[PDB]
Design an enzyme around this catalytic site. Structure first.
Site, PDB file in Angstrom:
ATOM      1  N   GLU A   2       0.793  -1.212   0.000  1.00  0.00           N
ATOM      2  CA  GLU A   2       0.000   0.000   0.000  1.00  0.00           C
ATOM      3  C   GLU A   2       0.829   1.268   0.000  1.00  0.00           C
ATOM      4  O   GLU A   2       0.350   2.303  -0.400  1.00  0.00           O
ATOM      5  CB  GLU A   2      -0.892   0.037   1.256  1.00  0.00           C
ATOM      6  CG  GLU A   2      -1.923  -1.099   1.331  1.00  0.00           C
ATOM      7  CD  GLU A   2      -3.044  -0.983   0.349  1.00  0.00           C
ATOM      8  OE1 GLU A   2      -3.860  -1.862   0.154  1.00  0.00           O
ATOM      9  OE2 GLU A   2      -3.047   0.157  -0.278  1.00  0.00           O
ATOM     10  N   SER A  33     -12.681 -19.758  -5.940  1.00  0.00           N
ATOM     11  CA  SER A  33     -11.289 -19.724  -5.483  1.00  0.00           C
ATOM     12  C   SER A  33     -11.197 -20.097  -4.014  1.00  0.00           C
ATOM     13  O   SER A  33     -10.235 -20.705  -3.618  1.00  0.00           O
ATOM     14  CB  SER A  33     -10.609 -18.377  -5.565  1.00  0.00           C
ATOM     15  OG  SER A  33     -10.806 -17.764  -6.804  1.00  0.00           O
ATOM     16  N   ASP A  36      -6.468   6.794  -4.784  1.00  0.00           N
ATOM     17  CA  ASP A  36      -5.967   5.455  -4.935  1.00  0.00           C
ATOM     18  C   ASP A  36      -6.000   5.001  -6.392  1.00  0.00           C
ATOM     19  O   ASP A  36      -6.305   5.796  -7.280  1.00  0.00           O
ATOM     20  CB  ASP A  36      -6.601   4.493  -3.922  1.00  0.00           C
ATOM     21  CG  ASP A  36      -8.035   4.105  -4.203  1.00  0.00           C
ATOM     22  OD1 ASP A  36      -8.683   3.332  -3.517  1.00  0.00           O
ATOM     23  OD2 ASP A  36      -8.499   4.616  -5.291  1.00  0.00           O
ATOM     24  N   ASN A  60      -7.304 -19.585 -10.965  1.00  0.00           N
ATOM     25  CA  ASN A  60      -8.679 -19.037 -10.846  1.00  0.00           C
ATOM     26  C   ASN A  60      -8.661 -17.604 -10.294  1.00  0.00           C
ATOM     27  O   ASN A  60      -9.398 -16.722 -10.706  1.00  0.00           O
ATOM     28  CB  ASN A  60      -9.565 -19.896  -9.922  1.00  0.00           C
ATOM     29  CG  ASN A  60     -11.023 -19.461  -9.927  1.00  0.00           C
ATOM     30  OD1 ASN A  60     -11.527 -18.775  -9.014  1.00  0.00           O
ATOM     31  ND2 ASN A  60     -11.738 -19.845 -10.974  1.00  0.00           N
ATOM     32  N   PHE A  98      -8.361  -6.581   3.274  1.00  0.00           N
ATOM     33  CA  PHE A  98      -7.962  -5.231   3.503  1.00  0.00           C
ATOM     34  C   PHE A  98      -8.168  -4.373   2.243  1.00  0.00           C
ATOM     35  O   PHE A  98      -8.659  -3.265   2.286  1.00  0.00           O
ATOM     36  CB  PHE A  98      -6.475  -5.261   3.785  1.00  0.00           C
ATOM     37  CG  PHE A  98      -5.977  -3.920   4.206  1.00  0.00           C
ATOM     38  CD1 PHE A  98      -5.490  -2.989   3.267  1.00  0.00           C
ATOM     39  CD2 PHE A  98      -5.940  -3.576   5.560  1.00  0.00           C
ATOM     40  CE1 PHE A  98      -4.998  -1.742   3.684  1.00  0.00           C
ATOM     41  CE2 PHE A  98      -5.434  -2.366   5.980  1.00  0.00           C
ATOM     42  CZ  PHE A  98      -4.975  -1.423   5.034  1.00  0.00           C
TER      43      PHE A  98
END
Length: 164
Positions: free
Chosen positions: A11, A117, A20, A132, A104
């Site tokens: 991040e 998945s 972002d 996948n 997150f």
């Protein structure tokens, strides 16, 4: 390596309001503030979050404080979630960190949407699940990061970040 160091690599750290990858107003270590177009709505959310008039800027400490709250809420989210918990429980410690990382970034709901998945991770079919997971908007939009997470689920080691 631990969950905090991992997410800090993915991040980054920014002390001034920023947008972002999706264009949203964020600050610190990936703390989303608002999906709203207004920088003003953003500054208001920020001040509400910090408990002070920040005027769009925070300190390291403040960033870290928001970060600890966010990881905590991510974990508790998984544990309260009926689709997520069973998978979390079935995983080893490193792979657990990979699921926390997705939650997150994309929220509980988002991850819970990866039905197939999740089923493969639970069954411990590492290779199938990695293939996948790559078939998603997620991977297509933020590939360097998705790849790192995916290899973590694939190998169960921290190789993808030992680089970084």
């Amino acid at each position: 390596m631990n969950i905090f160091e991992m997410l800090r690599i993915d991040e980054g750290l920014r002390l001034k309001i920023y947008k972002d990858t999706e264009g949203y107003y964020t600050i610190g270590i990936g703390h989303l503030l608002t999906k709203s177009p207004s920088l003003n709505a953003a500054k208001s959310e920020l001040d509400k979050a910090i408990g002070r008039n920040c005027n769009g800027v925070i300190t390291k400490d403040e960033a870290e404080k928001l970060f600890n709250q966010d990881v905590d809420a991510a974990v508790r989210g998984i544990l309260r979630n009926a689709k997520l918990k069973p998978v979390y429980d079935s995983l080893d410690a490193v792979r657990r960190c990979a699921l926390i990382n997705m939650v997150f970034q994309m929220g509980e709901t988002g991850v819970a949407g990866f039905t197939n998945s999740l089923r493969m991770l639970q069954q411990k079919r590492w290779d199938e699940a990695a293939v996948n997971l790559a078939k998603s908007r997620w991977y297509n939009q933020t590939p360097d990061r998705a790849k790192r997470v995916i290899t973590t689920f694939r190998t169960g080691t921290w190789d993808a970040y030992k680089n970084l």
